[PDB]
Design a protein around this ligand. Structure first.
Ligand SMILES: [Mg+2]
Ligand SMILES: [Mg+2]
Ligand SMILES: [Mg+2]
Ligand SMILES: [Mg+2]
Ligand SMILES: [Mg+2]
Lengths: 197, 141, 110, 117
RNA sequence: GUAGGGGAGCGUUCAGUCCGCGGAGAAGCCAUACCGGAAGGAGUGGUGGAGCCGACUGAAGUGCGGAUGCCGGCAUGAGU
RNA sequence: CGAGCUGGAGAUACGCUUUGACUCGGGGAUGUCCGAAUGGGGAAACCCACCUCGUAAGAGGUAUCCGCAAGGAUGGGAACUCAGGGAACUGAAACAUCUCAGUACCUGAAGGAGAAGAAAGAGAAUUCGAUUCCGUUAGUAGCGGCGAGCGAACCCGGAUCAGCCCAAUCAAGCCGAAGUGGCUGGAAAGCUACACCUCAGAAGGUGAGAGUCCUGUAGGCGAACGAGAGGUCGUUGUUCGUGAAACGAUGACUGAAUCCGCGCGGACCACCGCGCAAGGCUAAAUACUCCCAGUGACCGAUAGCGCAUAGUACCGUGAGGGAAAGGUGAAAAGAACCCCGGGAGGGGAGUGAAAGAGAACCUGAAACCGUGGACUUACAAGCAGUCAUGGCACCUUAUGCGUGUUAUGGCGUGCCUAUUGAAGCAUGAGCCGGCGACUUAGACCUGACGUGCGAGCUUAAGUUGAAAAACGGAGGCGGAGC
């Protein structure tokens, strides 16, 4: 149901996910994405074992007031962190079809607002950057919106470094997070944008 | 300019019933959780047995499991699905994937049709059902 | 504890250069550089002046009054000036001396 | 991540330690004793709400038979008169009349005496 | 209504997102007679002197009066 | 490299440096005495010698084990590797076979890895084609006081991929684009008005918050010359516990064949099939982290390493054990001078935005100790509150509303634990602050909710891209039971 910007005017293709998008499924997706990215570094000498301390103390009875083994327990100041964090994952495999349904459903959200398909940045000339801003100006890209650029042109990418604007994404290596993270999607390079299955 | 809630990354909702909160042991003061004696911060009294019924019950038995066959029902071939053909590679591709074990045909479906089956064995009333409906069942040497 | 490494024990002036003081009090004021402490990031210019007291009993007469002396700064003075104000540096080559590389900007004089 | 108590306990503690006003000694100064005192105060609080309601009616009744006896009667008798004169259903207010309006109280004594004998 | 089971929520740190605030004064601390059905939350003022609230979602070293609990400070006995 | 340097050092004096100091990168040269310690002794760091060269000073040598000799070995390494030796607590709700476990520990040998390795094999298709590792098969097969419990391998998918020989780019470093005025402020980097750069808006610094002020970043350059056999007895290994126990392995005794020959295929026989022991080497995939870099829903001073640095102080004859401690200010401008005091300490003056930052230097809770004010108390019986009323005081969510306090009346057996039964003369607790207890794991099992596909559903190891996810169908679960 979508047109084009530069290079032609077709678009129209793709049976986009029904009904008027599901936040619940996108939620399931983002969570998984952030869960995978999460590093499992957990600085804790949890065990009464791991902390540096001896093993016997001040006798079982008659010291008058105590009952202690050694200076390493979690009840001791400077002891173990019994139940503290240890290095782990949180990376899991979110069903394939849900990942596929994910970004499709996410693209659908950008259709219901501000979507953008382009055929080459012949409108760019070198890297220059100053000239990407010029091109963006022509297509309502002022800077009032966060923009996501998904091009395969290694030079049109090179003209993306700027502020409250663009995050530049390569070789159709897209993300449901990245597209929801920005206001507009410059879907650009119509390589993944058309033909599959 | 004014204060705005806005839709997107922050408008992403839980999903209702998606995931409830765990059990943190203090719902009022009056939580001195587990039992009240002999249910202790120890590593399990166990959960099976060795008299609690299992022992005190009999058998020397003898376990085997030589060859088990894949049940290829008659109703799969008959009723629906027009003869795409049996052979070996086609029965798999349609829906009867397993490897390691041989196949078997059993008499369940009743629609009557001409079919040529290529199973590794079949029941008396399975062979005497494909032929009666028209067709051959090919069993190897 | 750290100290003046945030740069690279590298300055933008010499113990001779005339420099203008950008930022703070003494803004715009100019002067010759008389002490350059690279690691410490200190500049002794004829700029910021102080009145330092003298704790001097036995130390050459108990007559240890107040002293007129200038107190050091950092990078809170933009080095080298010619078009009346502070500037960066870009054009190097050589003068009569090849081994030396000069400095300059929108103009060409230091 | 680590999540130490910081600020939560001290705030929890100051709340209790402020309900402790004219609390004698440790009961107003140390948390554990201030808090402990309040548990028992809770008993007294909930009980004294429904208790004042017995307390007052008691005071009310006392003033009634005092005046009832001033005009050769008594609470038992007087009330029965007002009850027997179905028309009379003061009950609440009745004590203030005895205490402030003696002229008026007498009228009601005289009415009560009729409905009876 | 005890053990126990079930439900709805308050608060803390960290995180992603959005809306913001701040040396014409942030957090923290201190006072208070205000708000909410409770955990709690706000206004004003005082101190402080450089960072931070709110909303949604995520994750936890997430809530203490007790353990002759641990560390630290300070009391009592006693001007004995 | 291109002007400063004279270590931390907060410190003066003497000096050194464009005939290029300092620092950084790379070589050399000197390296007392101890330590394998090695001339001999020795209670480490000290005693005492001899031999050769020599003007004395001074230099060289003098240990044992290998080998002709060149040349090699002794000793030290956090963890990882193989080897020799090898526990018990514990589980079995007792215990003895069994488990813990060939774990812990000791000992040996070695390296950046080792180990293993080139079929007398796996094994049942007359398939395979060295080893190690990962997924999987699979908690299957099996072992088991058939108890607690223990537990393979083949196939398949994957990382890497070799078979050879004998005996008869990265460190030093340089270059690197682009903002000015007004305003608030002690101070601009903030606010405001117009401006530019962007292959560079990563980051630190600068009196507050930084694209364009410094260091840098993207991008580029870059070094003289610098690294990259069978048997019997005894036993045992693996799922192998005497079982029907094969096979390996070996302490004691024995002891063959030589290719119409030998060994194996889970007693054993025949047939069918797989393979050539009694010689040695062999990279890569694997493991660990003293050290180095990067990163983090890791910590931020009772946390985090024991240490914001200390294996110190302190404790112990010794082995060993073992702390706590952070913060002036933007900059020392670290307070000259005055006053009380021997001093300590303060008060001023001055500096600073602030000294409401003064060196017992950020905030500065609470317990605890005080001074001052309000209301109060010297006929009173008390879990210390609570309700009601009166008196006094006060007016910044706060004048009918209360706030504080106080007299008198009524009522009133701390808290927790444990318990048939707690004020209990039953337990715990001096007080405050902080620290302090239902977690994490597994392709595990079973259930509720939820979502995606749905008679089908799904990937694991890995592979390729990583400001990111796609591929990978080996395998797992429905699908037929008895
Ligand atoms: Mg620790
Ligand atoms: Mg306590
Ligand atoms: Mg602190
Ligand atoms: Mg150390
Ligand atoms: Mg007892």
């Amino acid at each position: 149901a979508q047109i084009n910007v530069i290079g032609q005017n077709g678009g129209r293709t793709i049976e986009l996910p029904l009904p008027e998008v599901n936040s619940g499924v996108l939620h399931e997706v983002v969570t998984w994405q952030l869960a995978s990215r999460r590093r499992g570094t957990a600085s804790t000498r949890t065990r009464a074992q791991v902390s540096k301390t001896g093993r016997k103390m001040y006798g079982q009875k008659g010291t008058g007031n105590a009952r202690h083994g050694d200076r390493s327990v979690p009840t001791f100041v400077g002891g173990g962190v019994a139940f503290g964090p240890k290095p782990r994952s949180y990376d899991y495999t979110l069903p394939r079809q849900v990942r596929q349904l994910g970004l499709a459903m996410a693209i659908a959200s950008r259709q219901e607002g501000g979507k953008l398909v382009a055929v080459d940045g012949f409108d760019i000339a070198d890297a220059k950057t100053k000239n990407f801003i010029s091109w963006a100006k022509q297509n309502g890209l002022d800077g009032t919106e966060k923009v996501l650029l998904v091009t395969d042109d290694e030079n049109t990418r090179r003209a993306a470094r700027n502020v409250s604007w663009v995050s530049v994404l390569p070789v159709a290596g897209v993300n449901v997070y990245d597209i929801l993270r920005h206001d507009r999607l410059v879907i650009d390079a119509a390589a993944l944008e058309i033909v599959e299955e | 300019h004014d204060l705005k809630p806005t839709p997107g990354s922050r408008k992403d909702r839980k999903r209702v019933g998606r995931g409830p909160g765990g059990t943190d042991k203090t719902a009022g003061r009056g939580h001195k959780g587990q039992k009240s004696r002999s249910g202790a911060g120890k590593g399990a009294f166990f959960e099976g047995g060795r008299s609690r019924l299992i022992a005190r019950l009999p058998k020397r038995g003898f376990n085997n499991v030589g060859t088990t066959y894949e049940v290829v029902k008659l109703s799969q071939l008959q009723d629906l699905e027009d003869t795409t053909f049996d052979r070996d590679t086609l029965e798999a591709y349609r829906l009867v994937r397993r490897k390691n074990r041989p196949v078997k045909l059993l008499a369940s479906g009743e629609i009557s049709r001409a079919v040529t089956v290529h199973v590794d064995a079949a029941s008396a009333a399975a062979i005497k059902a494909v032929e009666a409906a028209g067709g051959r069942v090919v069993l190897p040497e | 504890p750290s100290a003046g490494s945030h740069h690279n024990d590298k300055l933008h002036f010499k113990k001779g250069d005339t420099v203008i003081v950008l930022s703070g009090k003494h803004k715009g004021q100019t002067g010759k550089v008389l002490l350059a402490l690279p690691r410490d990031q200190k500049v002794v210019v004829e700029g910021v002046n102080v009145i330092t007291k003298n704790v001097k009993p036995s130390m050459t007469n108990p007559q240890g009054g107040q002293e007129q002396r200038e107190l050091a700064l950092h990078a809170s003075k933009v080095a080298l000036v010619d078009p009346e104000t502070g500037k960066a540096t870009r054009v190097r080559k050589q003068i009569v001396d090849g081994k030396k590389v000069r400095v300059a900007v929108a103009s060409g004089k230091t | 991540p680590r999540a130490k108590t910081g600020i939560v306990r001290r705030r929890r503690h100051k709340k209790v330690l402020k309900r402790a006003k004219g609390f004698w000694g440790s009961r107003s100064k140390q948390y554990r004793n201030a808090f402990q005192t309040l548990l028992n105060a809770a008993t007294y609080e909930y009980r004294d709400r429904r208790n004042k309601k017995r307390d007052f009616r008691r005071l009310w009744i006392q003033r009634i038979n005092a005046g009832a006896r001033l005009h050769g009667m008594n609470y038992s008798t007087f009330i029965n008169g007002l009850k027997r004169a179905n028309i009379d259903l003061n009950r609440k207010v009745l004590a203030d009349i005895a205490a402030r309006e003696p002229e008026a109280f007498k009228a009601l004594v005289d009415a009560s005496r009729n409905a009876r004998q």
